[PDB]
Amino acid sequence: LIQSEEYVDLTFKLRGAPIPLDNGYLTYAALSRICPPLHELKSIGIHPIAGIPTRNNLLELTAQSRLKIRIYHQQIPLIYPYLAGQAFHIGQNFYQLDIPDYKPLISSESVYSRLVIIKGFQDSTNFIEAVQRQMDNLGIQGKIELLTRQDGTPQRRQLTINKEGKQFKVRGFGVKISELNPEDSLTLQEQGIGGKRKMMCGIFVPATRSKEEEET
Amino acid sequence: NSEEDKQYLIFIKVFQQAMKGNFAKIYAKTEEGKDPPIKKKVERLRAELNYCYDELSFKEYLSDFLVRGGLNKYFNEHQEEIALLIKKSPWQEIRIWSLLAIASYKPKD
Amino acid sequence: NSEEDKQYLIFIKVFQQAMKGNFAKIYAKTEEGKDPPIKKKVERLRAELNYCYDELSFKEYLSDFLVRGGLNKYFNEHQEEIALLIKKSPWQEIRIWSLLAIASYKPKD
Amino acid sequence: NSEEDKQYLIFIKVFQQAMKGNFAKIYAKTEEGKDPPIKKKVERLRAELNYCYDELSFKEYLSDFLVRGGLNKYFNEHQEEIALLIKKSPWQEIRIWSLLAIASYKPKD
Amino acid sequence: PNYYLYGTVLTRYGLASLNHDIRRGNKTILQKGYWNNGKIHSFVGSSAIRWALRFYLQKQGYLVNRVWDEEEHINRLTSEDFDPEKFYDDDIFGFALLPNQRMGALGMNMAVSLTPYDGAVKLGAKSGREKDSTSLHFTEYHATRYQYYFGIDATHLKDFSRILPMIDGIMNLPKVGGSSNIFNYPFCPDSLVFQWTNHFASYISYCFEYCDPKSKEAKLSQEFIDEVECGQIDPSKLWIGGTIVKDLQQLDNFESSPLNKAHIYRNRNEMIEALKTVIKRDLGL
Amino acid sequence: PNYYLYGTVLTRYGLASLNHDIRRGNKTILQKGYWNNGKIHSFVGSSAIRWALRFYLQKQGYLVNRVWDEEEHINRLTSEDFDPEKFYDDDIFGFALLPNQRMGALGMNMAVSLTPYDGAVKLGAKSGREKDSTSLHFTEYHATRYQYYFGIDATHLKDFSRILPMIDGIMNLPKVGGSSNIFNYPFCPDSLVFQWTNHFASYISYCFEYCDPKSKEAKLSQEFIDEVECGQIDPSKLWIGGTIVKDLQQLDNFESSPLNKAHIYRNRNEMIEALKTVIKRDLGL
Amino acid sequence: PNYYLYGTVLTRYGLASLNHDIRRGNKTILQKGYWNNGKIHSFVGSSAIRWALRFYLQKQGYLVNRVWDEEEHINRLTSEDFDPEKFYDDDIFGFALLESTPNQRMGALGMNMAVSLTPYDGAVKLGAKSGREKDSTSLHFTEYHATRYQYYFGIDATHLKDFSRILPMIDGIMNLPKVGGSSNIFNYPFCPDSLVFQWTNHFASYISYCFEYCDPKSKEAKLSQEFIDEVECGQIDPSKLWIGGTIVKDLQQLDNFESSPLNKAHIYRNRNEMIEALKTVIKRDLGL
């Protein structure tokens, strides 16, 4: 019920060819090529693209699919002229961005993260204690829950970094966090958890997305 | 039978529900003793539908219209197939179906 | 009798109601001592009907005309039947039905 | 007289009224000269009726001609009967009735 | 003879929030669109500038049919019948009620930001009655200079002497947008490129451009300089004044360039006075 | 000999709302349709350009039949019987009464926006309170440069000397379209490609194209340059001028290219003077 | 021998309202019908192109029985009895005197209706009589179409009374005057921009409509794959094929063009050079 200040969500309407579901490095590299200043930013995160799943491991862009960027509101003039109205290419297809819209950062009792990556922690217990430690670093109190598939197993996801010729394997979990109160909820949403925040992972969304991801 | 017309019919149904929701929102917008028009709302919707110039226009228009339609159940159990129908098919056919839905909307209220 | 004949007859009624609505709109449009149209508006409707090619243009024009007609009870009661009839059927047959409705609309006004 | 004979006679009267309207429109259009032709108009109508080769083309032409006729009071009084007769009957029989109406036509004195 | 006054005027640098688009949601976003180089620029409607000019005419004491109350925020008409012979408003801006209509000597275009919009946004707390609740809403501001193009048909004026008050109003333009102008943005010219000619053709539509996308100084477009040098624009009909003159005079080969023989004044008032003298001589005032 | 003047005219960059579609509702729809590469382009009707040319002929004192009132906003015919020998407008644009017909020496095609039409709707509220039909309104505008193609059959003119006023009018074209109060769009050419030949074949129709789908920059299409280089389009009959001259000269191997042999003038007035000299020599004026 | 000159010519891209239909109401419609894939294309009648060719023959001197007045818009016959030996138009286009030397002639030119390369979707232009007064003749609509046009023609050269009259006909096809239409507001030059001519001595042509579109809403034009397959399979002798115009660049950009049999055809980017070479061959064959 509290709208966070100093942090907004720059949302660009996204359209183009069907896109891989594990975009990650693809989208980040395309934006970096379009926007050189995006590489050197620190407290910025890119939202997972919202669109229905298509065949293979691809993702199809809808009219409701939009590229959303979480950024300090004073740092917008550093990336706005490079992104607003410009076009970026993923592979061989051209994708166009229009004038973005600003969305305030709303507080929620229960927040959700698609994907949390912590270096060197692969098992569930070590991952959970690592996220507890990360909460302790930023002073947030809450209960950690892990998203589960239809079988109840904790969910794992993989991030593919195609740096140079070799391709890289970086993996993490998808958590659901509640019992946060609005102030700490906003603090967690702005700061995020884990690493690879610009890498389409580590950011937090309300728990409606948590249930939606739990569906499929 | 021949579920193409099933998709056509439930598209008409969710369009009628969405336009009912938008008319309710307009009813919320107006105030005081001024009579909230009903026929003028339909005329405005038709004019806005005819205002488009293919593809981008009328596709984001009708998606935004359905989004402002509100809590539409028939939309909720028919998200994926209606999205597929919208992504496919010519846009003028979608406009024809929408206009037919407008012409056959009233008996809801 | 027969479902197709009933649908055709009540579609004729739908079109006649739509022309009544459009003619009332034209009546409201004109003012002062100028004579409102009666017959040359029917001639204009005929000319617009024959100015039609392919399935898309005629169906677009028919849907726009039906919406511009405004309120109509015959389309209100029968949504699925007329929606299927207009979406299906060759457009030339529907044009023939529309012209037949035009030639017999006048007893109302 | 049986009901079929009644509808047949009503259709003959409808076609004759339509020809009255079309010929009045022509007369208004070509008031110049000693007198607008009448035999030439009948020959034109016969040639255009004989041009039709299939059901769709003939019924399209018949509907267009009927609308061009004008009010057509006999169609006002008999919407459903005449509409069903035109829709149902084979186009050759309707052409025969139309040509009989042409032959049995009396120009206004 | 037919006489026309074409001009492009460049405003002073500063924070701007004028003529906002639809106030959808909590945000008050600017009127922005595409411009040259395919970048997003903020626009200001020309209707607002015309209203500001009309308000200047009213405030200076000139007889105008439409009068702004300034308190009830209601526009009142002195006379129901429009008389361009007597009213400055009807003579200059024309009228239409739907001689029941008049075109009007003044013709303008939208003001366009010099530099592309950087996307800067500002946070503000608006008042609320829900137990003194403050809701955070977004307002957009652009730190830029605006330039707009206007055309004057002097012959079309019922009274030829009415051009001078219009020039004075363009120079001393009142506040534009009124309540919507959150930050008081002075819209008075900082640099002028005027043209007093007898031809319909004008090549001074938008002659200003930015050296760098983030700068507080302006430069004349290379296209305009080329047009002056080639001989398309007659230097005797060209009037340049304001801050841009200071930058122009430091250009190399300025004396040899055909731009020198154009009427160039560092002071805007001197250029305006000289142009008004020329106009009075040509119009027989 | 049958002499024909073909030409494609490119206008200056600006915000334009000139020709609108059927007006009803909130939006004033810009006259737009499909064009090359299957994208929506805004259009300006050729009838509007012909009206502007006739108005130019009227304003310069040339004897014309149809006269624009400028006060009643109606068209008045000085003579009920058209006489192409005496009246410029009847000679150039022809007439039809319904000899009572004339084909007219001027043939012009519709003006096409260089840049595709994307967005750019304008807000049209009218002050505050009294939200009548003159309340919240939407206006479509396009920020582009329009381009049109015309052709004059010089020998078809009753008086051969009347082609020169047509060229002058094409140069200084008056107001085209309607939204001049808020969207002042000068239609004077800034780039021209003229061809003065004695063949019915023309290969210069719509020779301009954009370099960036959202930029003001314009460039001669590679098809036109290929046509000139292959051997078609005799360079001696080709007249190119305007701001496209700089871009043409900056091309590599321009000196060796056959395009260098065409009459290329950066100053449009110089091109027009040379072309008029050639036309007067050929037509014996 | 019996020499025939077949050819398909493609016009330039532009806004076209050339051939219209019955007046109808206030809206003037184009002549349109289904052409391919069930899509509706706009057509230009071959009688319009024949009239344009006649006008070209009249303008460039020559002897034509029909003289277009161009002032009262009337047609005058210099001689009431058609003489194909003397008049160019009678020799080329034939005649038919039915009211009651032969009274009829089959003509040496056979044309087909010009078909728009692009399907006709919308494109109605609003037209107003303007002013403040309004009347019945105030608001009207005119259909246009932004497309290229493509038509097919064949010439029976031996059927000509004078064998040398084919050359002015080729010149007229090249420098065609305006094809009947609303040139005041839609000026559409009908001069060719791509040519596929065949100068053979047998009746089979196989080059009727060789141009097809890509991206159905674009100005780009390409040779149909059927025509290329016809050339490569062995049919259509390349030595008898004359290709010229802007399609030459696209043809030369094709892969394996040098190894293709299409490379052996007479391909000229400049239309004048192609016409000159073709006329040299025609003069050699016809003994002119």
Set down the secondary structure blueprint.
This is part of a larger assembly, with one copy of chain A (216 residues), three copies of chain B (109 residues) and three copies of chain E.
Chain A: E1 3-15, E2 19-20, H1 25-34, H2 37-40, E3 44-46, E4 58-59, E5 66-72, H3 80-83, E6 87-90, E7 93-97, E8 101-106, E9 111-112, H4 124-138, E10 143-146, E11 156-161, E12 168-173, E13 175-178, H5 182-191, E14 205-206, H6 207-215
Antiparallel strand pairs in A: 1-5, 1-7, 1-8, 2-4, 3-5, 6-7, 9-13, 9-14, 10-13, 11-12
Chain B: H1 4-29, H2 39-50, H3 56-68, H4 73-76, H5 79-87, H6 91-103
Chain E: E1 4-11, E2 14-16, E3 32-34, E4 40-44, H1 46-59, E5 66-68, E6 75-77, H2 88-93, E7 95-96, E8 101-102, E9 106-108, E10 111-113, E11 121-126, E12 135-140, E13 142-144, E14 146-153, H3 163-171, E15 189-197, E16 208-209, E17 219-220, H4 222-230, E18 238-242, H5 243-249, E19 263-265, H6 268-283
Parallel strand pairs in E: 18-19
Antiparallel strand pairs in E: 1-14, 1-15, 2-13, 3-4, 4-10, 5-6, 7-8, 9-14, 10-14, 11-12, 15-18, 16-17
